[PDB]
Amino acid sequence: VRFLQPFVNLLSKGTYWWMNAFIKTAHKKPIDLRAIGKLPIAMRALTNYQRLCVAFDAQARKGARAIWRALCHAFGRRLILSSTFRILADLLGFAGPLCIFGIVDHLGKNAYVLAVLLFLALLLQRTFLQASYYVAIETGINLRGAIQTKIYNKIMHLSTSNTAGQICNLVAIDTNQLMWFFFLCPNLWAMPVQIIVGVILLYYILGVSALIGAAVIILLAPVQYFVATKLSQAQRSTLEHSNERLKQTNEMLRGMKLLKLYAWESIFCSRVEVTRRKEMTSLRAFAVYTSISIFMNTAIPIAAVLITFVGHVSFFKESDLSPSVAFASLSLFHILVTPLFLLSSVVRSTVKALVSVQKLSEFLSSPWRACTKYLSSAGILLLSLLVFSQLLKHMVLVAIDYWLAKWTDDQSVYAMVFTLLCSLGIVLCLVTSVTVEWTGLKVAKRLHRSLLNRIILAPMRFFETTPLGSILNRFSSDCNTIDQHIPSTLECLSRSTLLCVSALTVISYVTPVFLVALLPLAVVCYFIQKYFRVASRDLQQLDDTTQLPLLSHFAETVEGLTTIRAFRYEARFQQKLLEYTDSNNIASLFLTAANRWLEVRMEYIGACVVLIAAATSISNSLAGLVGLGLTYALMVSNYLNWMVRNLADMEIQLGAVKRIHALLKTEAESY
Numbered sequence: 327v328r329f330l331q332p333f334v335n336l337l338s339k340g341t342y343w344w345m346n347a348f349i350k351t352a353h354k355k356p357i358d359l360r361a362i363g364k365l366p367i368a369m370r371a372l373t374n375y376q377r378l379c380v381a382f383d384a385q386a387r388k389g390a391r392a393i394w395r396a397l398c399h400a401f402g403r404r405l406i407l408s409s410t411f412r413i414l415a416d417l418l419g420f421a422g423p424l425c426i427f428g429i430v431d432h433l434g435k436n437a438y439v440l441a442v443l444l445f446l447a448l449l450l451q452r453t454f455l456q457a458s459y460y461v462a463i464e465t466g467i468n469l470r471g472a473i474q475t476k477i478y479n480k481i482m483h484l485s486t487s488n489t490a491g492q493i494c495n496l497v498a499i500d501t502n503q504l505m506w507f508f509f510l511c512p513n514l515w516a517m518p519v520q521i522i523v524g525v526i527l528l529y530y531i532l533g534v535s536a537l538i539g540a541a542v543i544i545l546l547a548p549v550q551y552f553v554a555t556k557l558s559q560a561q562r563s564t565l566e567h568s569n570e571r572l573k574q575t576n577e578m579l580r581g582m583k584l585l586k587l588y589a590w591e592s593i594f595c596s597r598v599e600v601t602r603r604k605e606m607t608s609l610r611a612f613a614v615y616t617s618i619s620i621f622m623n624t625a626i627p628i629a630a631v632l633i634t635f636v637g638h639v640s641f642f643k644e645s646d647l648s649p650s651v652a653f654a655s656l657s658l659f660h661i662l663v664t665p666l667f668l669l670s671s672v673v674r675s676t677v678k679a680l681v682s683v684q685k686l687s688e689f690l691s692s693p694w695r696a697c698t699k700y701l702s703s704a705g706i707l708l709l710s711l712l713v714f715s716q717l718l719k720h721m722v723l724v725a726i727d728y729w730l731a732k733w734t735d736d737q738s739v740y741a742m743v744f745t746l747l748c749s750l751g752i753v754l755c756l757v758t759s760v761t762v763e764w765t766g767l768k769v770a771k772r773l774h775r776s777l778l779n780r781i782i783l784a785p786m787r788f789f790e791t792t793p794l795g796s797i798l799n800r801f802s803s804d805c806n807t808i809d810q811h812i813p814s815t816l817e818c819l820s821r822s823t824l825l826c827v828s829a830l831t832v833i834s835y836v837t838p839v840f841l842v843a844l845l846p847l848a849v850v851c852y853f854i855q856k857y858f859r860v861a862s863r864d865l866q867q868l869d870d871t872t873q874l875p876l877l878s879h880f881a882e883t884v885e886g887l888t889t890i891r892a893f894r895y896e897a898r899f900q901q902k903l904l905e906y907t908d909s910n911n912i913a914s915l916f917l918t919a920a921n922r923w924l925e926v927r928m929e930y931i932g933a934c935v936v937l938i939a940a941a942t943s944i945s946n947s948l949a950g951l952v953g954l955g956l957t958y959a960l961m962v963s964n965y966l967n968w969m970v971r972n973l974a975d976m977e978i979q980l981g982a983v984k985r986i987h988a989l990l991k992t993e994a995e996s997y
């Protein structure tokens with residue numbers, strides 16, 4: 327047992343301090359199934375299975391509702407403990423904007439004490455938030471173990487009269503949707519509370535104009551939900567053509583010998599290219615919806631701030647905009663963004679796992695070179711336009727946030743220039759979104775065409791030596807990755823890095839002394855990031871590689887069920903399944919603990935940054951520039967952990983482009 331998360335004092339339970347030792351070891355020598363621990367007794371497949379079966383007996387003494395109530399009876403204590411942590415973290419995160427309000431109101435007219443209390447509340451709030459995430463993940467994984475064991479125990483008893491692939495994917499995707507509903511279940515209860523208290527605080531701060539602002543920002547959640555629905559629709563319509571193109575590529579690759587013998591390769595390649603053109607026609611709509619999602623997500627808050635402040639000053643002829651009031655409202659808008667954006671995802675996952683539990687009831691009742699090659703496939707025109715648009719968009723963003731400070735203290739001219747710059751910002755953001763999506767599409771097209779052509783020209787000895795599985799897998803999974811994940815992830819990594827650099831630039835321009843303190847933290851940040859990455863890579867690979875046995879086992883058990891029951895070998899196979907699912911659970915649990923460790927450390931670095939910025943700016947001013955620095959240093963932590971998550975998410979996905987280009991360089995016959 328090397329997963330001693332339950333077995334430490336509450337502080338290291340809260341800051342995942344034990345993981346430190348592990349991660350340090352995991353940096354020197356690679357991670358093996360001997361280095362990762364064995365799960366505690368509290369979280370085993372047998373322990374959670376027996377807990378769930380006791381809950382099921384209790385519910386049967388008193389269908390889908392039966393399964394939901396049994397899952398409640400079995401995991402509700404920990405589910406509501408995670409929900410408590412999450413709601414306390416939500417309220418203590420709201421404790422930030424009003425504190426910025428108090429600080430800027432003091433110094434524009436008790437300030438240092440407000441700054442240190444902001445620091446303390448921020449530190450405690452981020453710790454509680456990460457602990458909430460962790461408890462939700464742990465109870466979700468325990469539920470996955472119990473449900474896997476239960477559906478396997480049901481596979482054992484079912485009759486020979488009865489769909490093996492259905493059971494295999496019921497273990498593969500339906501239990502997954504259930505576990506992810508349990509991952510996001512605290513959010514389902516704590517996002518409405520968050521949004522309500524946010525709108526209430528905004529109203530209390532800004533009078534009546536804040537309600538117009540909060541309505542405009544809330545108008546983001548339904549639009550995001552509609553966009554996500556259209557995106558899944560386009561996803562299915564793309565998967566159709568992708569499956570047909572895959573079958574055609576498999577035809578071309580099985581009979582490559584005969585084709586090359588009579589030189590029919592070019593005509594079959596042309597047919598595959600026609601199918602690829604149809605799939606690209608569908609991918610265009612998919613990318614349009616993805617671009618609309620990115621643009622709405624970034625542009626609804628800009629317009630919300632614009633309408634709020636302008637209508638507050640001109641239309642309402644309302645209170646004069648003071649720095650404290652304005653920047654408190656801005657911080658509350660930034661705190662309001664994320665719940666409004668992710669509420670659609672929470673609801674969609676909720677209905678998805680509801681369907682999954684209904685189905686389970688019905689069943690149970692019976693790499694820099696890769697980046698260089700990818701960017702070079704785009705061309706200098708699209709790459710230059712993309713980089714210029716990203717940089718100028720973030721410049722316009724910081725520009726409007728600074729014009730806010732200069733606004734606070736000819737008010738018509740200020741309002742007009744603020745409106746002009748917000749329009750410039752939304753146009754520039756739409757440009758950067760459409761450009762990243764167009765670049766993604768163009769690179770996918772070029773890379774796929776070159777790959778197909780370069781394996782058409784491949785010699786026969788190459789095909790005899792190379793496994794057919796790999797040549798098909800490059801077109802099957804990696805071209806899919808380049809088609810779907812690389813555009814969005816590259817765009818979001820660009821946004822995360824540029825927003826982080828922008829925030830540090832803002833709080834350095836407000837506070838010239840913070841720069842001196844930036845370099846230590848910078849170093850710390852770097853180190854942590856580095857170590858996390860290596861650990862997070864190993865674990866991730868391990869977590870994937872242990873899932874293939876499990877599903878495989880399920881498949882086998884469904885195929886040779888009558889033989890296993892004839893042998894009376896049922897207990898041995900249930901034992902093998904418990905061992906496989908325990909390997910998978912320990913892998914996923916250590917992966918999530920490493921994630922929690924990194925996000926806790928990055929949030930603590932963000933807390934130190936906000937404390938330094940608050941202290942030094944309140945000092946130098948003892949006005950609106952202090953509020954600017956305060957907001958940006960307040961939220962640097964999100965940019966930081968989002969950017970490191972996106973970098974980890976970026977390298978793995980870029981490995982696919984790397985190996986596509988690797989296969990692209992095979993020898994060609996001088997035809």
Ligand SMILES: CCOc1cc(CC(=O)N[C@@H](CC(C)C)c2ccccc2N2CCCCC2)ccc1C(=O)O
Nearest residue numbers: 459462463509510513664668669671672918921922925
């Ligand atoms: C903050 C990321 O850590 C997690 C967090 C969770 C639980 C969780 O409340 N998630 C929120 C995101 C946070 C920022 C609110 C969420 C809500 C809706 C849809 C997706 C998501 N997401 C979950 C996948 C990655 C981020 C978007 C699970 C798993 C993880 C994880 O380490 O993988």
